Amino acid sequence: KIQIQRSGHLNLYLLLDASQSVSENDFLIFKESASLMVDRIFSFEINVSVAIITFASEPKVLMSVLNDNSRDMTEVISSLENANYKDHENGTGTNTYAALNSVYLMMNNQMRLLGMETMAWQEIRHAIILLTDGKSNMGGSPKTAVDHIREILNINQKRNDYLDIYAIGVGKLDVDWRELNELGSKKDGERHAFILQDTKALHQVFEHMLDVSKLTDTICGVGNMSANASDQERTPWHVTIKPTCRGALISDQWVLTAAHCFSLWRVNVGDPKSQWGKEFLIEKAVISPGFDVFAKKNQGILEFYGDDIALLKLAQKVKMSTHARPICLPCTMEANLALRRPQGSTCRDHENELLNKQSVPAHFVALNGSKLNINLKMGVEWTSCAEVVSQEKTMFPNLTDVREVVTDQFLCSGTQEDESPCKGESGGAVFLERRFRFFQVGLVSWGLYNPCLNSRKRAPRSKVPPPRDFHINLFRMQPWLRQHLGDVLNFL
Template sequence: MRLSPCELLCLFLLLAQSTGTPDQPPQGNAECPEDTGITDGNATYTDELRVGSMVMYTCARGYYPYPAASRVCQSNGKWTELRSKTGHLIRQPSCREIKCPSQLDFENGSYFPRLTSYSVGSALSFECFDGYNIRGSAQRTCQINGKWNGTTPICDDGSGNCLNPGIPAGARKTGIRYRIDDKVKYHCMGNMDLIGSELRVCQESGEWTGTEPSCQYPFSFDFPTEVKDQFDASIANILDLTQRNKPKTESLARRIKIKKDGLLHVYFLLDASKSVGQKHFEMFQNSIAAFVEGLARFEITVNFGIVTYATVPKVILPVYDHDSADWTVVQAKLTNRTLYRDHHDRTGTNIRAALDVVYEMMSFQKTSFHLQKRDQIWYTIRHAILLLTDGKSNMGGRPKDTIIKIHRLLEIDEKRRDFLDVYAFGIGNLDVDRTELNDIASKKPGENHVFVMEDPESLKASFEDMLDFPDFGDMCGLANESSAATIREKFPWLVHIKAPLGSDSCLGSLIANRWILTAAHCFPPTIDSGLFAIGIRSDPEQIYRIRNVHVHELYDSRKKQHENIKEVYEYDIALVEIDEEVKFSKVARPICLPCTEASNRALKKLAQMTCDQQEKYLISVRDVPAHFHASSGRKLNVIIESQDQKETCNNKITHWPDFENVTDVPGYTSQFLCTAMQGRDVAACKGESGGALYVDKNKRYIQMGIVSWGVYNPCRNKAYDYSTQPPELRREPARPGQSPRDFHLNLFKPEIQTWLKEKLEGIIGFL
């Protein structure tokens, strides 16, 4: 039966309504067909087969999903296509072996073995011809992340104005002359991306412009330790903490650095697109929050700006906001659990729009400074942008165009190159557009600003110990608070004093590279020599000999024995001078003393702040949380009772048997800070005298007092096995109704400050 044209049209429309056409999404609750999986790997779904769900491909260690790690269920009921880098359609993904780039060229030397490909574990060896010396790694091994270990090997005879820049694995180089204004150009072979500078120019300073290039496969990634070390090295340059023990040549350190009390503006751009997911976005948040906390320790003013972005950006905190310099507020905003859900309509990754917001913030600030006639200050501000993304920008135009605008706004040229740092973190190596990130990131000699990580867990691992440098110069009160840090790294000022002649040991605190602060009663009147160790007993200790012990001249524990008072502890302070300098490191750093220029910088207070003002700032509330150390090194928590609580705290000593007949309580306590227990921690034990009573301000540690004496010894019961019991059970709790109190020599007292200034003149700067 033949159908009329009208009948054919009606039938077509009916079929289209019931089944949908290829160009239209199906009606109702569309689903994608079950994915056929990946050859030799596993496939998992983020939201079953629903629209928006992702199928994630994983392979065994040493292999990677090809050509992509994921696909998305689209509204037309189809999974996104899989295509190779050249555009060919791939029907089914597969797991392929990770390999490292081949060494294609090597100037002035030879290498072996010469193979077309190198699997994980393969080794390369390099040798130079006569007359040339090798720089970099003479032997390299292919790692499981698809990158060679070590650094690019180079054979050089030193005849050029610039050193030979070398040829990284997987690259070809044009240009063989290395004199002033000579150029070299690189390109990567195959399907590798070039990270770093494609073109480099030899300058009069003997330094090449830009960053050393590398060729990376789409499956390669950076180890967390690499990211930490390379990012730390760049940030250390900004903070003037780098190369302290090396010559300050152009090739080793930047020319322009943030000085103490300088200004730094940091902008965080966090990808909140759907592919990131709530769980991974929270890892972004926590990683950046840890970075903020670490940066807050430094003696510069940092203003933070926060932008989240997907299809459109959202400003969480403008860099010019009043709270942008308060790291606690910044952390609270960063860790807000609604930030990801705020992008409910997220369908894209608009990196350019996020960078446009940064440009607008900078423009507003520049105009504000100009109107206030503070242009000179504006041009001293350093700017750093940290971009986190799990893929490539798929809308909004080229992000690089906005970076060019930012360069123009900040007037970044060769002389001002160090006033802007753009760091690009790509999370999820296979889906990251490395070329785009490289276009965005800064390119500075000896530094890396592009990091590609395997997953958000790797980002978190990288940031855990971020900004923990081996050398902080003369900065006091710094410590590593990460979960992986040892006790010595967490409390690097802690000193054990091993008294001679079998006397009881004491604790002390490192305050300068030859000086230890402790209690006078730790030393017999006749002492003139002895040993003490930096560190704690559970770690290897470095032993130093005592050169001299300076006990306060007015200290005399027996001066009231004629009044039947067994011991008094006024002026219970001593300084130990050692016979060689302590080299500051992660496990040996000084704590900050109050009323010093260093503690003022740590607190980020004006230079003219007085000792009285500092005391009021640090003890401005009734109950001040503070800490001291057990002899094992464990940190114990106490409360400094101040203001109207102080008298009550002092008077508690009359509740103990040894002090029942004491009538002159102020005579015992006038020089001391009184502390009460907090939680399960009770009081100091014998052997913990001389240690620091300290507070935490902005993640910098300030010593307030010296552990001196108390009314209760929680370690007096020899039946307690203090060495094997858990830390919280090592101290015998006081009986019900008893109120243990400890007394710590108050370092703010004028008579104590006068003595410290006299002994430490020229060593520590006091207010």
């Protein structure tokens, strides 16, 4: 596997077959796949260098781990996007040996400049990925280059982890499966050779080529994008609150949730040992003191969710893992770096960054742990989304203005095909995904139809009022968030 961890350095070598057996179209699906792996590899904030080599009769180095810019993702993506298939128009053979001996020489060059004795050289782990139909036809057996590489890297039983070779045939084209399989590493328990139909199938496979198990620092908003990973792996900030409500780990001790959900309190966090999770006690609970559901009741608004926000300090720290991680909060320095945004960004800038469109795809997690889909409505579409509460005359018998219930404190979704949260889904993250990282923009507070009242009913199209969903917007809650968390999290 390609290991995602804080110790050491990762050199990733991306080898793109531009031989005569591949069209400029095959070649573009290689570039598209390599691009994705780069963006995914740069999502974890680890020390990584990317080499980019296209190859046919001979190898062409577009980017080298010896160059500083190989640690810079913009330089990498651009070195990659300036790859022309036609640069190999004069030697269209498939010389796999020479492509790998190209990586061998880069490694020899690097060891030379660093010194084979230094930790600079020796802590580097190396992953080669060839994107090819695998039909070598010149240059000799690539095994000669793989063995030179195993030798310079002093790969022994104790150093198996320092080298992975992948051979991946991605797209329409006819693939030699024996060449691929003979290319990739031979490690017990894992595959290094794949035949995949598009870049979407690469996305999923790439998730399982990564080993993130020893990534246990507090990095926020990191998750599993595999359809085959568990629900918790996909959303590890997600916690269960038994006062049922949901919540989100925002740190290694603190959990964000809804006030309306509230010694006997339990919080179930993710745990890699069990789908069952792990139970924690609360040490301290901070409930916004503006929250009071019946505050407008005597005046005809029978439930009011203004300031529906609460924080839980767990009684012990969570150990971070594939199953327990904070989500990123906007307006923190950590969110800033995950978004790759300029350093002096403001909270207004994060809001613009994350919620710029009039309809923003977002998610909340189901009772069963499934990730469900919503579209957050912004600007003039926020008004129309929110308007429908005038249909709801039992809860809101005396509503003069929409804003007496749906204030500026709420996000709005639940229109058209959106899912709608259920009652026990309250307090959980309303989140989104951007550059493979996860940001909490709101928390489930209330709405007009409860689908669960595993199984969700869809409202009848004739039901009044229609489903509609209102989430406490975290960009509206910064004073209170800062007041309780200024020493817990690093606010812009």
